[PDB]
Amino acid sequence: KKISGGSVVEMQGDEMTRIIWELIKEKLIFPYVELDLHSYDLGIENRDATNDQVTKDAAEAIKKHNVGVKCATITPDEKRVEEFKLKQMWKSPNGTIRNILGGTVFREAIICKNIPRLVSGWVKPIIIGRHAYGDQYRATDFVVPGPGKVEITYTPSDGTQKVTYLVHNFEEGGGVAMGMYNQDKSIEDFAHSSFQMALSKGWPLYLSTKNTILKKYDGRFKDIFQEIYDKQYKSQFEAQKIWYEHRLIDDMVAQAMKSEGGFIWACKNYDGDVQSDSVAQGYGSLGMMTSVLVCPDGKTVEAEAAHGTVTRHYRMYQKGQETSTNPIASIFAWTRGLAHRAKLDNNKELAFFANALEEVSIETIEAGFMTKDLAACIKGLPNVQRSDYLNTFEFMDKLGENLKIKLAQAKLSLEH
Template sequence: MSFALPLCRLSAGLSHRIAVAERSILVGKFACRLYSSMETKRIKVANPVVDIDGDEMTRIIWEKIKNTCEYFDLGLPNRDHTDDMVTVEAANAIKKCGVGIKCATITPDEQRVEEFKLKKMWLSPNGTIRNILGGTVFREPIICKNIPRLVPGWTKPIIIGRHAHGDQLFKIFCHLGPVSTTGISLSMLLMMTEFTKTRIGSEVASALIGLLYGCETWPIRAAELRRLQVFDNRCLRTVTRYKATDIVVKEPGTIELVFTPKDTAKPPERHTVFQFPDGGVSMAMYNTDEYKATDIVVKEPGTIELVFTPKDTAKPPERHTVFQFPDGGVSMAMYNTDESIRGFAYSCFEYALSKRWPLYMSTKNTILKRYDGRFKDIFEEIYVKDYKTAFEAANIWYEHRLIDDMVAQALKSSGGFVWACKNYDGDVQSDIVAQGYGSLGLMTSVLMCPDGKTIEAEAAHGTVTRHYREHQKGKPTSTNPIASIFAWTRGLAHRGKLDNNQELINRFLKKVLFVDNQSISFVALRFCDDLEKACIETVESGKMTKDLAICIHGLKDVKPEHFLTTMDFLEAIASRLREKRGTA
């Protein structure tokens, strides 16, 4: 093979092998190896995937699941060493290989910058990769019969399709000034701001992070209640009071967020939001500074404008006043392109059709008539033109709903549908849905690109910092590896589909003709499907990690005999897989 390495694996830099399964998956001269004590026939993989390493406890689990592939170290030290260019290289490698498998990574805040002595507060690698690849992140719960659900009525999965481009999640520009009139002005493209993370996320995290993997402070339902209370209160104060100026972009040009000081002797400050190659939408918002942020301050009163400058220099700029600040405050500008929205729509329709499940799209187009209205219009146009006939033939449907109505309907439903969300909505709802089904440790995450051929699979949870601290002390942990294993199975299954590798892909239909000329179709199970079933059956047999044991027994009543350590649980899965594959 001409390429140096086989699977595009985005990870944190270690290369151990462990007994997880009985097969070795050979790729070129390297192997992603899932071992047993018995050597059996190896499954040949013709082409590579990208392996992306990460941080902390998930990095430890990661090295136990895989072996060397086309490897990119996205651990914080290496990202800092390469000025984060390794993240860009990893994304481009996924484009080339078609499949990336990523370990959980750290998005640094001020504390992490100090801990790792970083050059700067690097952006989220997930955001960078998604911005390069585009597409939709599909998150699907892994259902185990014996794991209680916080929403008992959810008997079938709810798959969140999160648009992985644009909206209010990218980078910040700030307008600095004296403490006397505190406030901030933000322009954000594709990644959550430090403002949001430190002022909102810290309170949420205090209730949520420990909950996922056995917090010793919060009873599970009290922690969940506190998390929802914090989230609801922040949303009530922040989201429901926003004022938005949204516009439709109909030609190439540049969107800027411009702050003009009231003092006319001072020049305007201009911050480029996006250079549109074609049509799209943009929006600017503001609010008063209720968080008293001292790290980002507004210098003085002035006016925020959303300015579109056409590429055709013969045309004058379009200026839209967002707000005239009498004092401190915040402002935000965001964008999306028609091309990206169309790719989002196509991937959601295709995914829903493959699942034979209805598709819902949620926006707030009653308020954001142009911005969210563009999403609604494009989805409807594509559905009527390309998918309505196929959906009706499959006895499924597409429907647009307001986001608040959709949340209520989802809670009342039994599941069994795909929910298309804008970037921020999907970020929020995917975590809520994961907790509703039991745990973020039981959630798959696959980024599907508009070409239908390129994917990136990863665990939906974070790096499990608290467990990593225990691991550093040499103490055993009970960390749930299922989402990381499913990242590999989903990535390898897609590699198999691209290569028509029937030994590797999840399943295929086969018809058998009997002597009476009657035929029957059945599903022939293969490696990836066997491994996923081995994980679920291991949990359902009563062998699990502490986070799942807490779901069953409660935090106060869980005992050491109710759960296994991380490595013992991995061995239990390996044993179950050997039984299923007939190599015990």
């Protein structure tokens, strides 16, 4: 009799991560846990077949069941439209889901005692709090075909003020233009999530913007964070001997680089994307990073791997060549999802299982069994030999064996 897991929304994906996703369910989840699994295939072919309706339905299912576990998916471009003979260049499924759910994507490296960093000073963790709504990820962009005016207008519903601003008057040739926005309520939830995360970890909080350039747009993020801090969190930060400060983004990335870690970094959507990949790599690998969307309701989460479909690696699998893809981030999407499901259901057995799989994953790497990427952290990529790492399947087998052992010993450890 397996553990009673409960209701979980799973989103199947593409390429290398799709392969890995099936191996994880079969070898690490299904032998030990029984779930009411709400499966949505977000594979590029199924999104094309359903005119991207499957993505909207999966997002609505997460709203209802409170816990999502998502596989990395292809965001189609011109080359992808050609490859899969798509009806349209479908929008990012992550963007669709995040737009519907809202919240903050909290990203952090998965640390192993034997893995060396690329950044010497990072002795404490860096938690990135990426705002999951608006800006470039819900923008309107277009090609300007030739000379003419691009204007941006605001028309109040309950006002008079049709305000028209000239963006640019193209006098010779064309180019490109775009409009983007953000919402006060979403910014307020992002500020609250950031202050709360810093207080739960007991670390200082830094918000990065470019308010010297985008005086109104970024100035608003700065003003909302400062206002919420002064009125609702300042005394709490002072009590834990921590602080909150705004920094310019270019200063912030340089500060982070020369720091020792141990802080929460509130990032605007775009910066959170870019810098989350820099922080994961700085600590060792993109395969070694947790990614959880924490919704503003405080009950709903969508767990995923911060990295993508690992297309480069999938192209090697396609050629029947050997692959060594790190499945740890994909595994931690399941464990973080199951841990949240356990917390909602007060399921001590599911919570034990979720944590045990995380320990098994870290212990296996710490025991010297790892994928090529992690072996390159220790030895340097040119000094890496076949004997130093395990392939994708080999690594999954070792994890399955170690998981079986950890769960057997835990059961035996139970006293009368």
